[PDB]
Every structure is written in C-alpha cells, then in structure tokens.
Amino acid sequence: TCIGHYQKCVNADKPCCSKTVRYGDSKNVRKFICDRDGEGVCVPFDG
Numbered sequence: 001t002c003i004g005h006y007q008k009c010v011n012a013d014k015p016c017c018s019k020t021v022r023y024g025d026s027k028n029v030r031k032f033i034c035d036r037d038g039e040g041v042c043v044p045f046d047g
Helices: none
Strands: 019-020 028-033 041-045
Touching: none
Parallel strands: none
Antiparallel strands: 019 028, 028 041
16 A cells, blocks of 8 residues: 555555665664655655
8 A cells, every 4th residue: 555666646645655774773764755746756755
C-alpha cells in the first residue's frame, strides 16, 4: 500500500513507502511525501 520512489501520486490516496537503514549509533530514516507543486509525484523527504 505504498509506492517506491518518484511515482505519480495523482491516481490514489498517498502511497509512499519509507527506507529506514541502520548500523549502530547513527541512524538514517528516508521518507517519501507526495508533492503536487511539481508534476504530482511522490519523492524522497526527511533527513
């Protein structure tokens, strides 16, 4: 129930997965929002 990355968000609710990698002391969480200002597509965010 979520799109990968850089997809069209003008054909559904707001499907956008997320990539939260790990390692140890440091942690990076990649988010994906739905932007309409551009071409109405879901792109990476956060971090």
